[PDB]
């Protein structure tokens, strides 16, 4: 019959030497994956923060280099408020350009016909851009304005060791300036310490932007970073991280498929002995959901270290997709780590409340999701033209939930005492929905939470 | 009789279907309610967004140009000690206004007679107010005031492309100095993206206040914006929200007069058949409060899409009201949204929970509230004095209800350790007051919440 | 006998009234003295924000007027590190001093003879206090100091409408450098609003302070106020604060007079009739604790009243403990209002819930009081000399107790990974005695008084 | 037999006294014990403290002396980013230096060859660091570094009461420039109060470091501070300290002993009496973990009283070791006087309730870490680059931890919308991960925290 292979299978590792004295293959390759995946995030991470490290130092030096009157921290509200301010900006950045070799601290080289497509063979690209047709005059309200944009361009090249001073600027039909230039150096710590020279290719950009045309034009500095090789073991070890997962890969699949054959042999003989229907949740009982999160490790961990090896080879710069794919990897083996508690009592009590618990969880979560979504639309409406904490969706949400968990409450509110929303009303409405917002979701839906888990424990103790 | 109306009254949507056969005609009608209720709000949002933006962005402008060394951030904090400084300031706001045409980065218009009432069709009024007669002496405390207000004016015009500099202050006696002026610009944003252009005019009112008299003169510079129209799918929108609602709130009013009528039916014919007395209660389970919910949230929405119409069409501006009505409605909405998940057992648990546990968690709120408001009154009272957070009521009670869901502790006991409250007693008492009622709230009565629900949920699970 | 006086007594005030006709008069008593005490507060507080503020302004504004390069904010930084920069100062602050009449924007009148006792009828004191034998010689260690202070005092008067300039220093030896004057206004304020004129006379001290003898001299400028009266129906009200509560304090006195003859009529009579041995609590029994906080509240009242017509007067300027027993007052009337709530069922419930768990709070606050003040004494010994937030006992504790109550948390984390304590030894330490500490007591105190709680109400619940 | 060994044994020490008259000495012992450590710890605290102040401010006022155009609060800001710049740091730190006497506020001595190694008896030293060479080119990349390390000093005398101006600096190739020289003061303060005299020798380092070659160079001052003797009843109470621990560790460990003995006369007889197996926790049921706890403490307050008679004979200097022992012995002690309310049944039921729990938390706490640790990975690996607050592994962990305890959320969501991490994709991976660890770990994990002592408690009232 099957009552035996359903005995072996749906069977405790520690049981399972026993019968068939099979060794646990599965059981130390788990283990060994998991140190090894660590590992190899912890490297990743760690030659990661250095770049990151240069090439935000680097743009730190660039900013106070080329911003005029530039101080650490007055980012967002670094701006210019009038026509002479702007010249003088834009002619400081010019000028610095001009004589970063005998000014900088870095040694910056250079790059030729690095202006961008604006830029003719010449190394920084001094750009504005304005309306074809401007005609505004607030005077008596005539407007006659074409929204076809006009690109003007000076072309600025450093001196072998003045055209941009004569810059007229469309004040009245301005859309934004723009200054274009890269430079190029050497990560000096990559040359000393392993012996791998990095060749950094900084893109500059400096942005006047008037699109809001608010009389205030605020002026960033954005800077994107090429590495290339100045003219192991990772690989090695990246190379056994993937051998690892696709063993790993190989036996979880193998077992899924053999716990599926089996499944298919049970629910025939159960119509060919007593013919009755089986349970949707009774054929999910024989697919190990330990498996399927092994095999989507798997995946993600063989995927994120093909796109590291392409990185750590200077060949994809794809950092972001690389890092998602690899922490979420890790963090799913290291959850992973809880099958082997729950072979053991104490821990599968716990575990198991929190499993049972997570249906009526949820549930409640469903229930709550439309209460809060309500106050985030109320607030998000009402508080938004007077709440710096409220001037997006996103940004209501963030609000309420760390409302909802007790952090930045007084902050919400003495914002909102300051100018009292510039009318006793919305004054008044912000404290009835600041209060009974907080009072509903601190002392009535955590309070079910706690219940809910309290009651699911409760269970399974006393079954 | 009425048994079988009975029945197919107070009966769930889903059994609603099986007898008579009548289709949910409510049931999607809500839904799409709240679908477009949500979509107008949000196209609302991001439209009243915008506006906010090139408000605060223009009156930042105009600080920037008008006050003399203002930095950003410093508007709370911004003053004048000095004869010398308050001459400075109200000179260098004139002479700023005189040139902005070639200094300021945005297109500005002289408004000419937008003084207001003391400018007789001049675009700018510097006026001083002072009491008429002041004698103030503190040499020998020799006072003679004369409480009348005598308001000083003094007329100027900007320049066609110096009689303030004469200006006299009678600081022993000045109330205030305040500059009024206009400017006229125009959208840009508007008149490319949404091709209807706006015409904003700017009312700068720059106030040198001195009623506190204590050798501080406070300088704050606001604006108020009236926004013309320079010389809709919303709106068609607008009419079907308008359309739809009415039809909720028709509908939802026959099922409510039905339900008045068949209780008044009940109620008679349980006195023909037995003589007993109706409960408050019993005559109140005949009116569904969701029904009553929906027509309030409609009224909000018919009443703010009014509202919402007279605003976009540069009638009425009055942006606070209509938002709350939106809002309110919204989240009501939102909130009805629950009625769905009542006609399913696991959700109703829950719901169920909360609705039997929301009478003792109301006492016990009334039972705490004293408790918290003496605290509040003997907070105001003596730490009022030597801490910034317990200034005003509103602001101690701010700060309480923060400590009581842990948020901003600390801050609240450092700034008692820095002064000391000048006296060793004060600090004394601050630290028993503030120790006693944390202790108190958290320890003791958020536990109470948390044990009052448990017992409910315990009730609905075991009933 | 005496179970019908026992059956008087001990029972509820509805019931009271049914027996004899005894209308309710302390019933009505307490509440109007209830809303005449927090009447009486709330005109007491705004009075009292109103000299606060008026204070405040006029110190900030001498700050700016006096104190070097003062900006705001700096308060605990502002210090001199040269020679020259004390000089400068102490120059600018004379100075300013002698040309205040036509700088200041407040009319403030030089007193003559305000400098303290080392003016001998001089407005200005300007004094520097040295050891009278310094020696100190780092070279070779060679010292020889007398600890005797002397005081050279230099006499400065206002011009009426430069010896001052020849101050040396002996900054080896030199203690601290003072400036004393005062400054005479008056408020307008009072001499408007209220039409009852108050004369301020600000004691402006300056002091460079240099008993630390570490390089950095501190500068301070602090103002002491005594408001005096230019050359109701307050009064009226307060002396209606006094009667109500001198009748509330007669009748609780006697209310607790006929308690005592009956306990002790009622313990004669069990030794009478049946010889046993009265329990402690059963005498305890017979007096109500609602009648020792009303004469408590009522005695602290009278008190605080009595002050406050003193101070209102200005003949006292105690504002400290008047507002101290005032708001004491208030809080023990405000939470005397629970006794009225106590008479309900489904709040007695509630408040019987707290006053059963009580006394097991009491013992758990006990039990792990040892162990948060082993954590105090060894964070402060520890993390005292690299943490700001251990620096003192007091700020330990109210650090440890935020920490408990989840409020900055990252920050005490933060500043520890700034400096990493200076040894890899104390950053480790600091984190096991961080994460110990905020796991200990959130995990499983917190819970165990939600046990409490929880088991408290069970109990109310299900006797 | 043993069984009246064992009940005199393993008996309350007020039953103790009933039976053979034993006086209590090992009360009384550990109370004096706990006294005198505690006032120990706080004498040990305040002098502690006393130092550290006087470091602290002699550190920050020669940061002030010799760092240019330095303010308080930009420390780890301090940098320069021009080679004029950093030309005028160290020229202006070194004629600060040699015009100290005259400028400072402080009295500091020249220490005559106190610039280190590199100098040879001169004052200060003057240290430039560069590769032998550097050949740094990247105008086409071509690179020759040879990195070896290559010291240039220049020796720096101050004058009898200018070569260093001759500095050229390797830009390409530099390092750092380190400014190396000693300051000698006397602690007046000890000087006048206590009568002992401290000289103190300031080792001052000046490091302008360029190590990372990103064109910021960071400027810090960092001070290391000698404490000898200019040319009692702490060491009495040091004594009693020593001794009373020395007595309690002897008394405890004879207990021990004899515990231990009494045990092996138990396990022997068992096999005499009935042959059966011992269990490990019988055997440990017979030592008192008081006891252990005891000579643990005692041993710590030996050890850290011994560093503290070394140290306050200016013989050690080793504070961060001895401050340690010092605090973990009085958090040992004060968490033993719990011992005595467990001889009293109410506190007994608290105390045994955290003791029944602390297996299950600790359990807990072992499944929920696997989680936790797979968030810290996952967030370092994708958070690092764009968040302040995931920086390092140990910053990653404090983050979290602040955010289940509720601390530092908000701040913690806005840094992520503030540049979205320079992509939406990570964007929405911090959004998913912030939302989903802070919902799993607040309402799921901690609620399972306050079930497990609510059952413990539970188990405890009903065993
Ligand atoms: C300055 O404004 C112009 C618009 O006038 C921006 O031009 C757009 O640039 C993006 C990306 O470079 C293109 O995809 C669009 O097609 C451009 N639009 C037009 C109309 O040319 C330009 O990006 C702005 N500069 C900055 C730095 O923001
Ligand atoms: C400057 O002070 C005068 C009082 O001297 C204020 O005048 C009041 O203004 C409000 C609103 O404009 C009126 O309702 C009052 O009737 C005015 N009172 C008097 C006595 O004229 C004036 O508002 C102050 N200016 C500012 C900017 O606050
Ligand atoms: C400046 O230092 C002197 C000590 O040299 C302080 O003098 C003490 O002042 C207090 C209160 O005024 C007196 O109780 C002491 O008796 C004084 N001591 C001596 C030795 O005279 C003085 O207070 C300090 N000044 C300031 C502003 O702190
Ligand atoms: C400046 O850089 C040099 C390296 O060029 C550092 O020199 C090291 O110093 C430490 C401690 O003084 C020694 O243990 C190393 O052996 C030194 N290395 C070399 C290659 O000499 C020096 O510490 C740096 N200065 C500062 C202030 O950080
Ligand atoms: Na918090």
Same mark, same amino acid.
């Given at each position: 019959?099957?009552?035996?292979?359903?005995?072996?299978?749906?069977?405790?590792?520690?049981?399972?030497?026993?019968?068939?004295?099979?060794?646990?293959?599965?059981?130390?390759?788990?283990?060994?994956?998991? #140190?090894?995946?660590? %590992?190899?995030?912890?490297?990743?991470?760690?030659?990661?923060? =250095? %770049?990151?490290?240069?090439?935000?130092?680097?743009?730190?030096?660039?900013?106070?280099?080329?911003?005029?009157?530039?101080?650490?921290?007055?980012?967002?509200?670094?701006?210019?408020? !009038?026509?002479?301010?702007?010249?003088?900006?834009?002619?400081?950045?010019?000028?610095?350009?001009?004589?970063?070799?005998?000014?900088? #601290?870095?040694?910056?080289?250079?790059?030729?016909?690095?202006?961008?497509?604006?830029?003719?063979?010449?190394?920084?690209?001094?750009?504005?851009?304005?309306? $074809?047709?401007? $005609?505004?005059?607030?005077?008596?309200?005539?407007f006659d304005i074409?929204?076809?944009?006009?690109?003007?361009?000076?072309?600025?090249?450093?001196?072998?060791?003045?055209?941009?001073?004569?810059?007229?600027?469309?004040?009245?039909?301005?859309?934004?300036?723009?200054?274009?230039?890269?430079?190029? +150096?050497?990560?000096?710590?990559?040359?000393?310490?392993?012996?791998?020279?990095?060749?950094? !290719?900084?893109?500059?950009?400096? +942005?006047?932007?008037?699109?809001?045309?608010?009389?205030?034009?605020?002026?960033? =500095?954005?800077?994107? +970073?090429?590495?290339?090789?100045?003219?192991?073991?990772?690989?090695?070890?990246?190379?056994?991280?993937?051998?690892?997962?696709?063993?790993?890969?190989?036996?979880?699949?193998?077992?899924?498929?053999?716990?599926?054959?089996?499944?298919?042999?049970?629910?025939?003989?159960?119509?060919?002995?007593?013919?009755?229907?089986?349970?949707?949740?009774?054929?999910?009982?024989?697919?190990?959901?330990?498996?399927?999160?092994? %095999?989507?490790?798997?995946?993600? +961990?063989?995927?994120?270290?093909?796109?590291?090896?392409?990185?750590?080879?200077?060949?994809?710069?794809?950092?972001?997709?690389?890092?998602?794919?690899?922490?979420?990897?890790?963090?799913?083996?290291?959850?992973?780590?809880?099958?082997? =508690?729950?072979?053991?009592?104490?821990?599968?009590?716990?575990?198991?409340?929190?499993?049972?618990?997570?249906?009526?969880?949820?549930?409640?979560?469903?229930?709550?999701?439309?209460?809060?979504?309500?106050?985030?639309?109320?607030?998000?409406?009402?508080?938004?033209?007077?709440?710096?904490?409220?001037?997006?969706?996103?940004?209501?949400?963030?609000?309420?939930?760390?409302?909802?968990?007790?952090?930045?409450?007084?902050?919400?509110?003495?914002?909102?005492?300051?100018?009292?929303?510039?009318?006793?009303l919305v004054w008044?409405?912000?404290?009835?929905?600041?209060?009974?917002?907080?009072?509903?979701?601190?002392?009535?839906?955590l309070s079910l939470?706690?219940?809910?888990?309290?009651?699911?424990?409760?269970?399974?103790?006393?079954?």
């Open positions: 019959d099957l009552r035996r292979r359903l005995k072996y299978f749906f069977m405790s590792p520690c049981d399972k030497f026993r019968a068939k004295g099979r060794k646990p293959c599965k059981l130390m390759l788990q283990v060994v994956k998991i #140190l090894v995946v660590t %590992v190899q995030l912890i490297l990743f991470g760690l030659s990661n923060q =250095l %770049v990151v490290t240069f090439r935000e130092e680097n743009t730190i030096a660039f900013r106070h280099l080329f911003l005029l009157g530039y101080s650490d921290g007055s980012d967002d509200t670094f701006a210019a408020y !009038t026509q002479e301010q702007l010249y003088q900006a834009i002619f400081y950045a010019v000028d610095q350009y001009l004589i970063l070799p005998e000014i900088s #601290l870095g040694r910056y080289a250079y790059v030729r016909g690095g202006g961008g497509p604006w830029a003719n063979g010449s190394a920084l690209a001094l750009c504005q851009r304005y309306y $074809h047709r401007g $005609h505004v005059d607030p005077a008596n309200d005539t074409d929204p076809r944009v006009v690109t003007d361009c000076i072309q600025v090249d450093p001196p072998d060791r003045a055209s941009y001073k004569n810059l007229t600027l469309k004040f009245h039909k301005l859309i934004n300036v723009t200054i274009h230039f890269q430079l190029k +150096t050497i990560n000096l710590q990559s040359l000393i310490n392993n012996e791998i020279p990095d060749c950094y !290719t900084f893109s500059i950009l400096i +942005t006047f932007d008037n699109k809001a045309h608010s009389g205030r034009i605020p002026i960033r =500095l954005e800077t994107k +970073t090429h590495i290339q090789e100045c003219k192991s073991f990772r690989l090695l070890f990246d190379v056994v991280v993937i051998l690892t997962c696709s063993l790993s890969f190989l036996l979880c699949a193998r077992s899924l498929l053999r716990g599926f054959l089996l499944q298919n042999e049970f629910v025939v003989f159960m119509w060919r002995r007593r013919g009755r229907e089986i349970s949707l949740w009774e054929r999910l009982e024989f697919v190990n959901g330990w498996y399927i999160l092994l %095999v989507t490790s798997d995946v993600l +961990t063989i995927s994120g270290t093909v796109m590291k090896i392409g990185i750590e080879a200077k060949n994809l710069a794809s950092y972001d997709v690389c890092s998602i794919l690899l922490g979420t990897s890790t963090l799913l083996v290291w959850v992973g780590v809880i099958r082997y =508690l729950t072979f053991f009592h104490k821990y599968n009590i716990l575990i198991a409340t929190l499993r049972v618990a997570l249906p009526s969880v949820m549930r409640f979560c469903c229930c709550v999701a439309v209460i809060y979504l309500g106050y985030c639309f109320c607030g998000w409406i009402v508080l938004g033209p007077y709440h710096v904490k409220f001037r997006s969706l996103s940004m209501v949400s963030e609000c309420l939930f760390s409302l909802i968990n007790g952090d930045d409450m007084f902050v919400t509110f003495a914002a909102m005492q300051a100018q009292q929303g510039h009318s006793s008044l409405f912000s404290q009835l929905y600041l209060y009974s917002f907080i009072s509903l979701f601190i002392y009535m839906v939470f706690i219940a809910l888990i309290t009651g699911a424990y409760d269970t399974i103790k006393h079954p």
